[PDB]
Symmetry: none
Subunit: 41 residues, 2 copies
Protein backbone atom coordinates (compact mmCIF):
# COMPACT_ATOMS: atom_id res chain seq x y z
CA UNK A 1 0.00 0.00 0.00
CA UNK A 2 2.67 2.43 1.14
CA UNK A 3 4.91 1.59 -1.86
CA UNK A 4 1.91 2.20 -4.17
CA UNK A 5 1.26 5.57 -2.50
CA UNK A 6 4.88 6.68 -2.84
CA UNK A 7 4.80 5.91 -6.56
CA UNK A 8 1.52 7.87 -6.85
CA UNK A 9 3.15 10.77 -4.98
CA UNK A 10 6.15 10.62 -7.35
CA UNK A 11 3.83 10.61 -10.35
CA UNK A 12 2.29 13.84 -9.04
CA UNK A 13 5.72 15.38 -8.59
CA UNK A 14 6.33 14.59 -12.27
CA UNK A 15 2.94 15.96 -13.39
CA UNK A 16 3.98 19.20 -11.56
CA UNK A 17 7.39 19.33 -13.32
CA UNK A 18 5.49 19.03 -16.62
CA UNK A 19 3.16 21.93 -15.69
CA UNK A 20 6.24 24.03 -14.84
CA UNK A 21 7.61 23.26 -18.29
CA UNK A 22 4.22 24.13 -19.92
CA UNK A 23 4.17 27.42 -17.90
CA UNK A 24 7.54 28.43 -18.98
CA UNK A 25 6.57 27.71 -22.59
CA UNK A 26 3.40 30.00 -22.48
CA UNK A 27 5.32 32.76 -20.70
CA UNK A 28 8.01 32.49 -23.39
CA UNK A 29 5.42 32.86 -26.16
CA UNK A 30 3.71 35.81 -24.39
CA UNK A 31 7.12 37.47 -23.99
CA UNK A 32 7.84 36.84 -27.67
CA UNK A 33 4.56 38.51 -28.55
CA UNK A 34 5.31 41.58 -26.42
CA UNK A 35 8.84 42.00 -27.85
CA UNK A 36 7.62 41.48 -31.42
CA UNK A 37 4.75 43.96 -30.95
CA UNK A 38 7.33 46.45 -29.56
CA UNK A 39 9.81 45.95 -32.46
CA UNK A 40 7.00 46.49 -34.99
CA UNK A 41 5.27 49.37 -33.14
CA UNK B 1 9.77 40.07 -19.18
CA UNK B 2 6.81 42.51 -18.75
CA UNK B 3 4.99 43.05 -15.41
CA UNK B 4 1.80 41.13 -16.43
CA UNK B 5 4.05 38.20 -17.41
CA UNK B 6 6.07 38.36 -14.23
CA UNK B 7 2.92 38.48 -12.08
CA UNK B 8 1.66 35.38 -13.96
CA UNK B 9 4.89 33.31 -13.77
CA UNK B 10 5.41 34.35 -10.16
CA UNK B 11 2.05 33.06 -9.16
CA UNK B 12 2.25 29.78 -11.08
CA UNK B 13 5.84 29.03 -9.89
CA UNK B 14 4.84 29.76 -6.30
CA UNK B 15 1.74 27.50 -6.61
CA UNK B 16 3.59 24.60 -8.21
CA UNK B 17 6.47 24.79 -5.69
CA UNK B 18 3.95 24.62 -2.87
CA UNK B 19 2.33 21.56 -4.40
CA UNK B 20 5.82 20.04 -4.88
CA UNK B 21 6.80 20.77 -1.27
CA UNK B 22 3.55 19.08 -0.11
CA UNK B 23 4.27 16.03 -2.30
CA UNK B 24 7.85 15.79 -0.98
CA UNK B 25 6.51 16.01 2.61
CA UNK B 26 3.93 13.30 1.84
CA UNK B 27 6.69 11.07 0.44
CA UNK B 28 8.87 11.55 3.53
CA UNK B 29 5.83 10.79 5.69
CA UNK B 30 5.05 7.62 3.75
CA UNK B 31 8.66 6.55 4.27
CA UNK B 32 8.22 7.13 8.02
CA UNK B 33 5.11 5.01 7.95
CA UNK B 34 7.03 2.27 6.14
CA UNK B 35 9.61 2.30 8.98
CA UNK B 36 6.71 2.09 11.48
CA UNK B 37 5.26 -0.87 9.60
CA UNK B 38 8.73 -2.55 9.65
CA UNK B 39 9.00 -2.04 13.42
CA UNK B 40 5.48 -3.46 13.93
CA UNK B 41 6.19 -6.44 11.67
CA UNK B 42 9.35 -7.18 13.74
CA UNK B 43 7.26 -7.37 16.96
CA UNK B 44 4.67 -9.47 15.25
CA UNK B 45 7.18 -11.97 13.88
CA UNK B 46 8.90 -12.17 17.26
CA UNK B 47 5.53 -12.82 18.94
CA UNK B 48 4.57 -15.50 16.36
CA UNK B 49 7.89 -17.35 16.69
CA UNK B 50 7.55 -17.30 20.47
CA UNK B 51 4.06 -18.79 20.16
CA UNK B 52 5.18 -21.56 17.71
CA UNK B 53 8.48 -22.58 19.30
C1 LIG C 1 0.59 -0.24 11.76
C2 LIG C 1 0.51 -0.59 13.23
O1 LIG C 1 0.47 0.54 14.09
C3 LIG C 1 -0.52 0.38 15.10
C4 LIG C 1 -0.63 -1.07 15.54
C5 LIG C 1 -0.45 1.40 16.25
O2 LIG C 1 0.44 2.45 15.92
C6 LIG C 1 0.11 3.73 16.49
C7 LIG C 1 0.03 3.46 18.00
C8 LIG C 1 1.19 4.76 16.04
O3 LIG C 1 0.66 6.10 15.89
C9 LIG C 1 1.25 7.12 15.06
C10 LIG C 1 1.40 6.61 13.63
C11 LIG C 1 2.54 7.68 15.69
O4 LIG C 1 2.35 8.06 17.06
C12 LIG C 1 3.47 8.56 17.76
C13 LIG C 1 4.18 9.54 16.85
C14 LIG C 1 3.01 9.36 18.96
O5 LIG C 1 2.76 8.51 20.07
C15 LIG C 1 2.14 9.24 21.16
C16 LIG C 1 1.01 9.99 20.48
NA1 LIG D 1 14.08 36.46 -22.02
Amino acid sequence: LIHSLIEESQNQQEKNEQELLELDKWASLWNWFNITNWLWY
